[PDB]
Write an enzyme that holds these catalytic residues in place. Sequence first.
Site, PDB file in Angstrom:
ATOM      1  N   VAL A 126      -7.644   8.564   4.163  1.00 14.86           N
ATOM      2  CA  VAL A 126      -7.363   7.142   4.005  1.00 14.86           C
ATOM      3  C   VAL A 126      -8.117   6.385   5.497  1.00 14.86           C
ATOM      4  O   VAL A 126      -7.671   7.104   6.761  1.00 14.86           O
ATOM      5  CB  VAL A 126      -6.272   6.567   3.693  1.00 14.86           C
ATOM      6  CG1 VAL A 126      -5.825   6.940   2.332  1.00 14.86           C
ATOM      7  CG2 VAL A 126      -5.025   7.177   4.536  1.00 14.86           C
ATOM      8  N   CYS A 172      -5.907  -0.061  -8.000  1.00 14.83           N
ATOM      9  CA  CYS A 172      -6.047  -1.149  -9.296  1.00 14.83           C
ATOM     10  C   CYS A 172      -6.929  -2.249  -9.011  1.00 14.83           C
ATOM     11  O   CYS A 172      -7.070  -2.744  -8.073  1.00 14.83           O
ATOM     12  CB  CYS A 172      -4.626  -1.658  -9.373  1.00 14.83           C
ATOM     13  SG  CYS A 172      -3.399  -0.542  -9.262  1.00 14.83           S
ATOM     14  N   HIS A 182       0.847  -1.054  -0.153  1.00  9.51           N
ATOM     15  CA  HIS A 182      -0.089  -0.061  -0.117  1.00  9.51           C
ATOM     16  C   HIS A 182       0.717   1.390   0.046  1.00  9.51           C
ATOM     17  O   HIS A 182       0.278   2.202   0.221  1.00  9.51           O
ATOM     18  CB  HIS A 182      -1.113   0.047   1.253  1.00  9.51           C
ATOM     19  CG  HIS A 182      -2.095  -1.158   1.328  1.00  9.51           C
ATOM     20  ND1 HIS A 182      -2.109  -2.125   1.906  1.00  9.51           N
ATOM     21  CD2 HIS A 182      -2.966  -1.505   0.068  1.00  9.51           C
ATOM     22  CE1 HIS A 182      -2.857  -2.766   1.358  1.00  9.51           C
ATOM     23  NE2 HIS A 182      -3.509  -2.409   0.453  1.00  9.51           N
ATOM     24  N   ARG A 224      -0.310   7.408 -13.138  1.00 14.92           N
ATOM     25  CA  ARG A 224      -0.976   6.257 -12.478  1.00 14.92           C
ATOM     26  C   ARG A 224      -2.081   5.675 -13.415  1.00 14.92           C
ATOM     27  O   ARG A 224      -3.207   5.890 -13.158  1.00 14.92           O
ATOM     28  CB  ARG A 224      -1.351   6.900 -11.163  1.00 14.92           C
ATOM     29  CG  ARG A 224      -0.351   7.273 -10.472  1.00 14.92           C
ATOM     30  CD  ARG A 224      -0.580   8.602  -9.361  1.00 14.92           C
ATOM     31  NE  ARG A 224      -2.129   9.025  -8.915  1.00 14.92           N
ATOM     32  CZ  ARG A 224      -2.466   9.850  -8.266  1.00 14.92           C
ATOM     33  NH1 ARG A 224      -1.342  10.957  -8.009  1.00 14.92           N
ATOM     34  NH2 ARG A 224      -3.549  10.063  -7.500  1.00 14.92           N
ATOM     35  N   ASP A 225      -1.556   5.014 -14.308  1.00 19.45           N
ATOM     36  CA  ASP A 225      -2.341   4.270 -15.471  1.00 19.45           C
ATOM     37  C   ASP A 225      -2.668   2.868 -15.414  1.00 19.45           C
ATOM     38  O   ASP A 225      -2.050   2.280 -14.581  1.00 19.45           O
ATOM     39  CB  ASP A 225      -1.850   4.779 -16.950  1.00 19.45           C
ATOM     40  CG  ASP A 225      -0.441   4.294 -17.323  1.00 19.45           C
ATOM     41  OD1 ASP A 225       0.415   3.991 -16.368  1.00 19.45           O
ATOM     42  OD2 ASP A 225      -0.201   4.091 -18.476  1.00 19.45           O
ATOM     43  N   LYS A 230      -5.101 -10.340  -7.005  1.00 22.94           N
ATOM     44  CA  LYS A 230      -5.745  -9.578  -5.905  1.00 22.94           C
ATOM     45  C   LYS A 230      -6.852  -8.674  -6.667  1.00 22.94           C
ATOM     46  O   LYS A 230      -6.549  -7.900  -7.434  1.00 22.94           O
ATOM     47  CB  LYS A 230      -4.714  -8.455  -5.054  1.00 22.94           C
ATOM     48  CG  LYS A 230      -5.339  -8.290  -3.824  1.00 22.94           C
ATOM     49  CD  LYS A 230      -4.217  -7.377  -3.018  1.00 22.94           C
ATOM     50  CE  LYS A 230      -4.556  -6.701  -1.815  1.00 22.94           C
ATOM     51  NZ  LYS A 230      -5.520  -5.731  -1.644  1.00 22.94           N
ATOM     52  N   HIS A 254      -2.760  -2.198   8.375  1.00 21.56           N
ATOM     53  CA  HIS A 254      -4.125  -2.552   7.572  1.00 21.56           C
ATOM     54  C   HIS A 254      -4.748  -1.168   6.826  1.00 21.56           C
ATOM     55  O   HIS A 254      -4.393  -0.006   7.448  1.00 21.56           O
ATOM     56  CB  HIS A 254      -5.032  -3.020   8.591  1.00 21.56           C
ATOM     57  CG  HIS A 254      -6.423  -3.525   7.898  1.00 21.56           C
ATOM     58  ND1 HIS A 254      -6.901  -4.593   7.289  1.00 21.56           N
ATOM     59  CD2 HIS A 254      -7.517  -2.920   7.831  1.00 21.56           C
ATOM     60  CE1 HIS A 254      -8.102  -4.589   6.862  1.00 21.56           C
ATOM     61  NE2 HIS A 254      -8.515  -3.303   7.519  1.00 21.56           N
TER      62      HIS A 254
END
EC number: 3.1.27.-
Lengths: 123, 123
Positions: free
Chosen positions: A103, A81, A13, A21-22, A40, A114
């Site tokens: 976040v 993603c 993370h 950021r593609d 994932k 986490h």
Amino acid sequence: QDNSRYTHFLTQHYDAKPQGRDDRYCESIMRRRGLTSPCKDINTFIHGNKRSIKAICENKNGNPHRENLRISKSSFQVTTCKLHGGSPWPPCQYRATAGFRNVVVACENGLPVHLDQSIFRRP
Amino acid sequence: QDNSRYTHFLTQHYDAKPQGRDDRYCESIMRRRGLTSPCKDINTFIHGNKRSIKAICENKNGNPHRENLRISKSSFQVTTCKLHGGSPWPPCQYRATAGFRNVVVACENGLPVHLDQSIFRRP
């Protein structure tokens, strides 16, 4: 065991300075980070500096949230993603979504261990 | 015309110090704010101080976002009221959702004049 949970968080993370950021960014960093092990279905990377992530755990940049989580006061550039194919086995095609938001993490001994992914499941 | 768009924003989208942000809170402030005129299907109130909302327009607390909008850098306590009955005509039953998040507004002459509601349509 000791501390190994935080460096798992940082490995799954955190991405300090990404370039575009593609879709292709998602695919190479998911595969560079082991998360294609099986594929994932969804995972979010946080950008910027570690100092600011780590302080969500304190009341400096943190707020208590739900049962046992914390939510940040400041916003972070984020890239989610998403698996876009229905199969868990490679090849793992990922679709990217860049965002800017606060976040939700879990803290253990003053260290994020986490990331709650549900807030990035946007319909 | 002049300035009247900002005080529309403040009337539909600002509530400084709410008490419980519950179903009954949504129903009395939607009716106290004229938004039950027909029943607005969804509307979000921002809490805290006006100074911080108004600065989203500057690069102090603002970031450019999509075509013509701005997104705040800091998070705000927010309460979204959702219509829960299928009819646009009174009685207007609203369901409340409290939240903490950054906000997307539109600015005009350095004053917020639109709140984007799509980010509060959470599934």
